[PDB]
Design a binder for this molecule. Structure first.
Ligand SMILES: O=[N+]([O-])c1ccc(O[C@@H]2O[C@H](CO)[C@@H](O)[C@H](O)[C@@H]2F)c([N+](=O)[O-])c1
Ligand SMILES: [Br-]
Ligand SMILES: [Br-]
Ligand SMILES: [Br-]
Ligand SMILES: [Br-]
Ligand SMILES: [Br-]
Ligand SMILES: [Br-]
Ligand SMILES: [Cl-]
Ligand SMILES: [Cl-]
Ligand SMILES: [Cl-]
Length: 837
């Protein structure tokens, strides 16, 4: 690495409610809430009705302090920097009597020269965190109107004034925990001569024959002299040097601008998940002065082109991603913060989340603008998992101020996070905000303000999202796409805009439209659509006592932030299922419903390629125990929707789709290679296992790369009787020439509430060892949408929420480090027919 010494200021911290003079131990990085929780000074914020009880914290100011030693030799180093990667939010930072910083942007990292304020021996760091409420009450009082941020759960919508995670003020799947604190690491660096303040590896061009890079460095020298040095870039792959370049320089005190070209011939491209390996080079830049490496910095670098094509075309305006020259149908989801308390999210939780996306066959995630610019670990994981990232700037669902001061603050976050993130292979585009132009045009805001205020809001929209933010992107990340908003034009209520750019089709849910509307109401790229579900009972039990197990109990409503959500789920459930009586049965069928309905959408979007070029459902994940649109609950349990997403995103999908009493079958592929001389084979099977008719075979089919194509159509009438349809399913398999199976599907001709489901019994044998449970499942009769339920949080299943077919044995593997030999894991197996008598 280099001759610098880094000291982690991560222990010895204490905190205090300002005004009390009482100091208690603190954890940094961390938050006021966690620190309080860890001394039992707050109840569990996620439990029961506790949300109301923790609100008092946002009205107090909080102080934090620590002390640390600096030695004589440490004090003699040339430079000493103090780095705050995150302060949330209005924080005055004091060191040995000196005010170093009045911080006012959660999303900005601060690097402070501190050599002249440091002392031999003991040093004292104090940080005063003004309440971001108290701090903004006068600002709001001067404003003369309330911004219409309904997700800000307070009479006064103060979120919009602070550069601070929007969701912390509340959201419609969120708890309001307006927290403060040192939310990312604090480090102190003791170094010689200079630091590298920025290292940008800029791809000038990429062909199969050659990668042309420009290594741009900003080096800040802290000593007065003219310093001869040698700048060195080593490019290596898997530990072996690929190319090495050098440059003699003489460094001047202060800032220096150095550029070295580097070329990799016959580069190995980074490819996204499902297209091959996410290959990552190592680039290390070094500043050498004689024998010492005084500063080194490295990046992992993926060589690839990404181009968002947004052009007028026959169908409206396209919106798709072209990766290393090939149009890539995008498959993934909208990501929210994983916790009400950000520093509580662990390295392992990040790691598991990327595993969840990778195993569901996703190749994209959108970091939605109500959360944060994610940490370095998140983008590193997207890099090495081949997951493309759409990064919103942090504006959502409301217009925002656009005064000169507010814009300067935004500019500093825009530049800070662009430079932090621009070397990530995963980083695919920037989006100015979520839904704000939609809000301004369609959400009935004009009726809420005077014409003068509203016009000032429209002009204010332009200065931020059409001027400041695109300008910053153009300046600091000139090869990446920027768009002002998502969706940029299309509105789900306006059929004529559907062919223009991306869509948030909230016609399902908000517009109450049936899932089948997804087959007809098509976008050029679905950047959001979603449906709510209650999480499973083990997650319900984490916030509710069994006495509260009612849809409309007070504790249950405390965990449903959509006021129409419960009835809407019931309205949709009646359309496809028999609504059961017990709460447990409802929750289970609520899971099946969300998974089945959303998957039909994902299918439609893939099937309808190239007119549609992507689908990102709302939402991946949860920040706490709550009813939401997620596919994975707060504890990391996959909902049915996550398994269904995996299936619907499989690189090769057989997609039977039934409309107007007729069945077509499409074969859908995101493989880069064409498959030839394939056979689709299908057979109707009743609920006892008995074939009806013989095998239908379709031979000599080609499945071309990156396409969706009809290969079969047949009417239902004369093909099968109305009664058959209620008592049988269609099995589909796709095999190569030799007869090797590459894909499988099952089709039902009727809605589940109309199937004549047999009362049946699912038996299983279990072999349990340390960390693993291996079940073999049996039912002589079809068992519909089965849910293998265990009480163990975060338990992972090879599969779940699948139909168990008559007489067909099924092996399911469950893993968890909590599983121990000689300790029967409890299993409860539910299926549709059991939910009614
Ligand atoms: O028509 N609407 O009132 C509507 C539609 C969508 C919407 O937000 C999207 O949907 C999700 C579910 O409502 C939100 O949680 C998230 O903000 C996302 F951007 C929001 N919203 O969060 O204000 C409102
Ligand atoms: Br210094
Ligand atoms: Br500095
Ligand atoms: Br971090
Ligand atoms: Br007004
Ligand atoms: Br723009
Ligand atoms: Br039909
Ligand atoms: Cl509240
Ligand atoms: Cl986020
Ligand atoms: Cl819109």
């Amino acid at each position: 690495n280099d001759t610098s010494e880094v000291m982690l200021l991560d222990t010895g911290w204490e905190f205090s409610q300002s005004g009390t003079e009482k100091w208690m131990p603190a954890t940094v990085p961390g938050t006021v809430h966690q620190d309080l929780i860890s001394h039992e000074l707050l109840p569990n914020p996620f439990y029961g009705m506790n949300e109301k009880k923790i609100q008092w914290v946002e009205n107090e100011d909080w102080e934090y302090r620590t002390s640390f030693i600096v030695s004589e030799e440490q004090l003699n180093r040339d430079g000493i920097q103090l780095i705050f990667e995150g302060l949330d939010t209005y924080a005055d930072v004091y060191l040995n009597g000196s005010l170093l910083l009045k911080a006012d942007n959660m999303f900005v990292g601060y690097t402070l020269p501190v050599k002249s304020v440091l002392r031999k021996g003991e040093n004292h760091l104090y940080i005063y965190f003004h309440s971001p409420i108290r701090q903004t009450l006068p600002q709001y009082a001067s404003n003369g109107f309330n911004y219409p941020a309904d997700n800000d759960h307070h009479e006064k919508h103060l979120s919009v004034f602070s550069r601070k995670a929007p969701y912390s003020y509340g959201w419609d799947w969120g708890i309001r925990m307006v927290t403060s604190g040192v939310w990312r690491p604090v480090t102190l660096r003791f170094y010689d001569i200079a630091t590298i303040s920025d290292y940008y590896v800029r791809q000038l061009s990429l062909t199969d024959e050659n990668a042309r890079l420009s290594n741009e460095l900003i080096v800040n020298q802290i000593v007065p002299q003219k310093i001869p040095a040698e700048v060195r870039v080593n490019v290596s792959l898997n530990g072996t040097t690929v190319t090495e370049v050098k440059q003699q320089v003489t460094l001047q005190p202060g800032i220096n601008h150095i550029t070295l070209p580097a070329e990799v011939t016959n580069p190995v491209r980074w490819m996204p998940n499902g297209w091959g390996t996410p290959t990552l080079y190592d680039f290390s830049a070094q500043i050498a002065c004689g024998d010492r490496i005084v500063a080194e910095q490295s990046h992992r670098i993926g060589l690839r082109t990404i181009r968002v094509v947004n052009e007028k075309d026959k169908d409206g305006e396209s919106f798709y991603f072209e990766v290393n020259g090939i149009p890539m149908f995008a498959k993934g989801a909208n990501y929210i913060p994983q916790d009400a308390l950000l520093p509580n999210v662990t390295t392992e939780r990040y790691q598991t989340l990327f595993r969840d996306m990778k195993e569901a066959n996703m190749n994209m995630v959108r970091i939605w603008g109500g959360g944060t610019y994610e940490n370095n670990l998140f983008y590193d994981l997207a890099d090495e998992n081949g997951i493309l990232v759409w990064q919103d700037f942090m504006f959502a669902c409301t217009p925002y101020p656009s005064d000169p001061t507010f814009l300067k603050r935004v500019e500093a976050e825009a530049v800070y996070n662009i430079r932090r993130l621009r070397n990530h292979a995963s980083l695919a585009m920037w989006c100015g905000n979520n839904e704000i132009l939609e809000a301004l045009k369609y959400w009935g805001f004009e009726k809420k303000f005077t014409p003068e205020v509203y016009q000032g809001l429209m002009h204010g929209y332009d200065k931020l999202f059409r001027e400041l933010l695109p300008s910053t992107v153009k300046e600091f990340d000139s090869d990446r796409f920027y768009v002002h908003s998502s969706p940029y034009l299309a509105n789900w209520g306006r059929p004529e805009s559907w062919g223009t750019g991306d869509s948030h089709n909230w016609g399902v849910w908000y517009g109450k439209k049936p899932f089948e509307s997804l087959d007809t109401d098509l976008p050029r790229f679905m950047s959001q659509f979603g449906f709510q579900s209650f999480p499973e009972m083990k997650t319900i039990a984490a916030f509710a006592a069994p006495e509260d197990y009612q849809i409309e109990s007070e504790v249950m409503n405390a965990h449903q932030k959509s006021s129409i959500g419960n009835s809407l789920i019931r309205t949709y459930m009646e359309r496809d299922y028999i609504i059961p009586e017990s709460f447990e049965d409802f929750v289970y069928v609520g899971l099946v419903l969300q998974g089945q309905g959303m998957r039909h959408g994902l299918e439609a979007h893939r099937r309808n390629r190239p007119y549609c070029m992507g689908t990102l459902y709302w939402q991946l994940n949860d920040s706490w125990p709550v009813v939401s649109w997620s596919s994975i609950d707060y504890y990391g349990n996959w909902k049915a929707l996550h398994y269904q997403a995996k299936r619907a995103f499989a690189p090769v999908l057989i997609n039977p789709i039934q409309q107007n009493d007729s069945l077509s079958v499409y074969l859908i592929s995101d493989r880069l290679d064409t498959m030839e001389q394939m056979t689709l084979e299908m057979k109707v099977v009743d609920f006892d296992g008995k074939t009806l008719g013989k095998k239908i075979q379709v031979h000599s089919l080609e499945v071309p790369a990156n396409t969706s194509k009809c290969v079969y159509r047949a009417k239902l009438d004369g093909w099968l009787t109305p009664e058959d349809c209620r008592r049988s399913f269609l099995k589909l398999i796709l095999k190569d020439k030799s007869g090797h199976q590459v894909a499988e599907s099952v089709h039902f001709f009727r809605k589940t509430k109309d199937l004549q489901l047999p009362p049946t019994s699912v038996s299983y044998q279990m072999k349990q060892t340390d960390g693993k449970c291996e079940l073999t499942l049996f039912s002589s009769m079809l068992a519909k949408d089965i849910f293998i339920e265990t009480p163990l949080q975060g338990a992972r299943y090879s599969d779940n929420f699948f139909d168990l077919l008559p007489g067909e044995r099924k092996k399911v593997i469950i893993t968890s480090p909590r599983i121990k030999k000689g300790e029967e894991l409890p299993v409860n197996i539910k299926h549709i027919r059991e939910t009614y008598k």
